Every structure is written in structure tokens, then in C-alpha cells.
Amino acid sequence: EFDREIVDIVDYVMNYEISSKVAYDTAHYCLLDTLGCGLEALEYPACKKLLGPIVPGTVVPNGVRVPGTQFQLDPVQAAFNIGAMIRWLDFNDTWLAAEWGHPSDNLGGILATADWLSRNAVASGKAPLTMKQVLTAMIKAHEIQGCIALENSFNRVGLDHVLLVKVASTAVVAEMLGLTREEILNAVSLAWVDGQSLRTYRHAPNTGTRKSWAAGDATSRAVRLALMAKTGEMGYPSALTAPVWGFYDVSFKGESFRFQRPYGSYVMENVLFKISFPAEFHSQTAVEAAMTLYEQMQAAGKTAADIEKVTIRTHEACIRIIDKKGPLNNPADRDHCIQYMVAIPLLFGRLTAADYEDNVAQDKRIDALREKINCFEDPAFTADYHDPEKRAIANAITLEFTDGTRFEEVVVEYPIGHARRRQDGIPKLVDKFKINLARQFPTRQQQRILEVSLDRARLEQMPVNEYLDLYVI
Template structure:
């Protein structure tokens, strides 16, 4: 055992996970909604994406793991490492799960891939009489979920990993490692060791989200982080020691090697803030663009009302936050769905042409929009600009907006139409958000073959804190053809 004291950042995370009591009724209420929403996103991915279906299942086809994790939407029984990868990937694949903004934008529900895979596996193992396991309930999942959201979100507020070329899923790996260690029953010393490995692990570059290398890896990056978290906890459970000064060690620690010598800024203590104020993605688009979709729908409606044609547009100006410009301003060629759903110009162009919200299928290579010359013509007329006030309000903890504005100028130079949206649907300050999240869950579950009776049972069952985790996950079981 090392004689060194662990870095204080790690000590604080483990103390929070192992000792903090979550009392907020709002936190639990939002966690239940987010849990259903995330599982609905996984079902949607299974139903919609052949690309995602090819990624899931045991490493060796036909393998059935005794007391294994039952992947929702399927009949597969998987080990928790591959199971965490599969569920994390399915929740994230269509870029439709919830999000949280800050200096770093991320998706805290990504952590549910690790949390649910481990909790379900342990719950089944306990029910099957396997030694060294403990009973786990839906309440245990909700607490782990709230704490993983909080860890990831608090780091995102002031620490921009993207500016260092690192992908935000590093925080999924860190948060998932901390809560999974607790679910597995590891000691606090073991949790510290596992957490240190999460920080000294190899970290993904952000290249797969940015031109010219944007690709489908962004759909399974969260699953990869989930699987790493579970694997690291299992390695520590098997006796691997940690690295106490993983952040602060001169030259070789994370701060010097990966973060330009800067230390993390954590502006508030861990509690339940993030789960209470995260953003539900009700439109299948990169998070910084969602209010632009909302604005574009309004502009399209005004054009229709005035008898104006999209062909008569001379110029489109999009005002956005600084983060939105950096991440989604893509004027060049787009090569795949992952490229398109992170392109502000493509998203706004398709929305203007449709006159309605863009959908996941509109990004696919075989979508008519992907090869429509009108889309490219419109993209060529677009300028994306940072609005400094939008950026300020985006970072202001009292405002926390995600504003965009879309302005269309017509060729006749007489009409200039603009819509500005600060709190789009899905934002915690939008009055219709929770109703629409409920509708989204129904639609996604219907896509996976679940009828309204089964869906209502799930809504009722998620309120049962004492239910064994595996009994809840069994309600999502379905036969699905993974080859087509």
C-alpha cells in the first residue's frame, strides 16, 4: 500500500458517494423521469439504428452469462463490462438523451450504462444465491444516478476538457467508477484506487466529434467509458492498487500531462443540483443547436404564413453561444450521420425545409436530406456568429440559457425574419418540458414494440423504491433481430 495520501479531489468524490444522503424529493422525481427517458432512448436506438445493433451482444456470439445483465430491449444476458458498453452506447447513440451545459457540455445519463449493468448483474446474482453479492433495489440505482449526474455536472461547470482536445466522456468514466465502486461494495480505499485509475487511464481525444474526423464513435464513446469504469472497479476488487497523486504528481500527473498544469475548478459542493436542473433532449440534435431548431421552426412558420419560399432566401445568420460555434459550426462536406447531427448549418437547413423539428432519421446516409441539393444550397448561405450575451447567459448560473437566434433575409431584400429562443423545450425552465418528456418516452417505447399498457406499468413501477433492480429491468425484455 502506498504511503501517499490520495489527492483531495478523489477523497471528496468518494466521501460524497459513500456518505452523502440524498433527501431532495425533486432529485428523486427528476431521476425517475430521466431513468425512463434514458431507457426509452436505448429502445429507440435498437429500433432505429442498424449501426447500433451491430455493436451489441456478447464478444463471442452465443455466450450466455449466468446471472448476467439483461440488456433492455433484448433477451441478451451479458457480463457487466460488455453490458455497460452496450447499454451506454444504446442510450447515447442517437444523441437523444439528456444533457448538462457548462464550460464542458456532456450527457450525465451516459452513466446509466454502467450503473444499470452492474446493479442488474448484482441483483440477479443475489437472487440466484451467488455469494459475495448484496440485494440492490431501484432506490440504489436512483441514488447512484443522482450522484453520478452530480459528479459529472459539477466538473463540467468550469472545466473545459474540449479545450485540451479531450472528450467529455472522461467524466462519464470518472463518475461511473465512483458510484459503481460503491454498488459493488468496494471499501473506500478501493474506491479511491479505482478512481485514480479512471484519471490515469488513457483518455479519448475529441477528434471523433470534430471535422474532418467526425464519425460514429461519438455514439459509442459513452459506452466505452462505462465499460472502462466497470472493468477498473473489477480490477481493483481483484487487488490492484491505486495511484494516490494521479492528479498532482509533477510532470506525470493529470494536471501537468493532460491539463496544461491547471487544477480543476469545482464551484459548488456536491449535492443534487445537477439532476434537478439538467436538460432533457426532446429534439434529436446536438444540444447547443436545439434552440436554433426551435427558432428555425418559428421562422419557417412565418415564411409559410407570408407565402414566402425557401428558394427565395438570400442569407441566413445564426447567432449562438461560443460553445455552440466551436462545436457545431461546420461549413464543409459532411460524410456521415455523426457529422450531420453536429452541424448547425445542416440542422437549421433541414428544419427550414421541413418546417418542423429535425428527427434522428434525417441524419442518416440514406435520408433524402443527406443528398438534397437544397440543403447544401442553404448551408452555403449561412453564417454562424457568436453572440457574446448568449455566451454570458449560457455560463451565468442564475440564467443557464442555451440561446440561439435564426435570421433569414429574402432575395427581394424586403423581408427579414428572425426568431430568438433562450429556453427551448427540454430546458428545465420551459413549462412544457416534463409533459413532452413523457410523450417522448411513449413514442420511443412504441417504436420498440411496447404497448401503452406496458408503458403505463413502467411509469408506475419506477415509483417503487424497494423493487429489486432485476425485476424492473425484466420489464424491458424483448426479442430483437440484431442482424438486420
């Protein structure tokens, strides 16, 4: 009697067999990338102040060992820790669609449940779970969340996207707990009937730190709902379609969930990785091209002070999300200016985060050359942007000199963090991970982690508990 949307999620999470090398490879990289972010977040007091157990000194038998910390918490509280860490700085993977999100947030509930389950197994002389399950669970979570967010937008109804994290995590975690098909159904319904937080903290003038831990709390809630269904807690069959009290009517505006495709492994296969310049995603390929123009102008003895017109041929979303003519002296100003993030590269030949303030944002071309940037929209690009087989973030920059000679409009279809650029992006991703690892562990420990981590075959065999033990201080 359970709504189809719910049954589809459960059946998928229960019987669907993933058979995609790309799916398991990307998941592999995603795990390391996510974990690394978590370690970097451990350098910020704003984050670490929310970590640990609710009551300091608490002792949990076979508690989840939170990476880079001393804490050994129960599955729920640990899920919140990991969840808040990995998403804190906002460097984890991304999935832009109808609804924006970071599927890697589900790692909180997954990792915690897997580690707790393994330590209990080993304690009882049983077989623990292996990192292979974690990868499988990740792929599945990315799907649930990734597919619903494909066409259904919740920021349009005032809700935050973390509700998808709670639904995904709940599904995967309940399955992982070995619950029956009934118990799992009950679990997912509870997630839909559960409350759904607002986005107030992601918008001005209330932009706050909750946007950093909202997901960690969502995935944590999932572990709690799943552990309840585990005890045999009842379900709510029409949690979504109920006539007046169902989710659809109450908070989805009397609409319904639309799906452009069934659950598979499409999401993980096309995830975006924050592993390049500190520039908004829609302006990534624009910066990469700005860098090529900088060295091509060098080999042509052309100073950035010769440009009298720079027309950028972007895509739909670009002009819509990043573009603002007129002076600006704030982070959200420069960090969201396709005109500015391209100005610096052409002027200095680099784009570091240390360029979105006032110190460097002084030069004339900082407010002058930017006034030579014309950003229009092209039908050819915006089409590939929505094309499921591409998902390009293409950009095209053309430099018009006073010498009556313009430069060959350079065009970058996919950013380095994109799925079709793994040959250039993975190296970067591995560098980031190695760096993050150094932030918390001694040279020796860094090598043990890195050596096992990079080896997929060797890592898939490792017992979840044994892998996380490599991150203990």
C-alpha cells in the same frame, strides 16, 4: 494521503444525501429516455455486432439481463452492452460545459452492477436493490462528471471525455458494491492512473464508430476497476498530483482541476434532453422561433419569398460552432448551419432530418434565402448562457420584408429540451420513449413497461432485477 480531488469524490459518493425533488424527477425521466435510446440502437447492425458475450454460448449465473436482448452477461461485459446501446445513436441526454458529454452514459456500469447485485441477492434469498438506488447513483454520477467538466476541459489536452465516465462510474459502482472507504479510494485512483483514450475517432478524417461506443467501454472499465478494488487491489494516493508521473503532469499539461462548486445535484437538475428537431443544440431556440414565424407569416399572407434580410441575434458559442456562408451538400454542412436550419422552417414550416441531404436541398432559397441570414453576437444572451441559474440557449430572429415592414423579432431563451421547459419537453420525452418501446416489444409488453416506468413512486420500489425483467424478449 489521497489527493483532495479523489477524497472529495469518494466522500460525496459515500455520505452526501440528495434532497431535491427536481433531482429525482429529472433522473427518473433521464432513465427512461436513456433506456429508450438503447432500444432504438438495437435496430442498427453496426451496434448489435458488438453486443453479446465475448464467447457466444457462455453462461453466467445471475448474469445481467441486457434490455431488448437475450444476453445474460457478467457485470463488466453487460456494462459495455448497455453503455454502447444508450449512446450509440447519440440521442441521450447532454451536458454542455467546459467539456462536452452525456452523463447518461454512466447508466451502463450502474445498471449492470445494480442488476447483477440484485439477482445475486434474490438468489441468496436476500434483499435486492431498488430502482431508487439506480436513480440516486445516476444523480451522483452526473455530479462527479458534470462538475469536473464544468471548468476542466480535456479535449484541450487531446483526451476524450469518456475518462470522466470511467471516473464517475468507478466512484458510484465501487460505493454500490459495498466497498469500504479505503477500497473505494483505491478504485478511483486506479481510474485516474488507467489509460485515457484519444479523440481521434471524433475528428476528421478519422471520424469513426468508436465515438459511439467509447463511453460504453469507459463505464465498462469502471466496473472492472471497481471489481478489482473489491478484491483488495492496491491504490495510488497521488495518482493525480504525483510530481512527474501523475495525471496532471503526464496528460493534463502540468495544470490542475478547477471547481466552480462542490458536488451536489446541480448537474442532473440542469441536463439537456435530445427531444426536438434534428438540429444542433445551439440552434434549437432558433428553429422554434423559425416555426413561430412560419405560422405568423401564414396568418399574414406572407410567403417566405418576401424575406430580404433575416438577422439572427444568437449567443457566443453559436456563431462559433454553427455558421457557414456559402453552398454545401453534406450532412455536417446543413446539420451545422444556423442559417440553413432556420431557412427550411421559414420555407417549409418544418425541419426533419430528411432535409440535410441533396434531394430537398435543391430549391433556390436553400442557397439563396440562407444568404439573407446575418448571425451576430449579443452580450445579453451569451451572459445567460454561462449563468448557472439560467444556461439559456436564446436566439432572436427578425424578418425584414420588401413590404417595408419587418416582423417582431421573436425570441426563445430556452429550448424545449431545456430544464426550464419541462412542461413542454416531458410530453415529447414520453412520446419518444413510447416510440422506442414499440420498436422492440409487443403492444402488451409496451403497456406494462410504460405503466410502471411512468409511475415514479411505483418504480422506485421495484427491485432492479424485476424492472429489467420487463425488458426481456
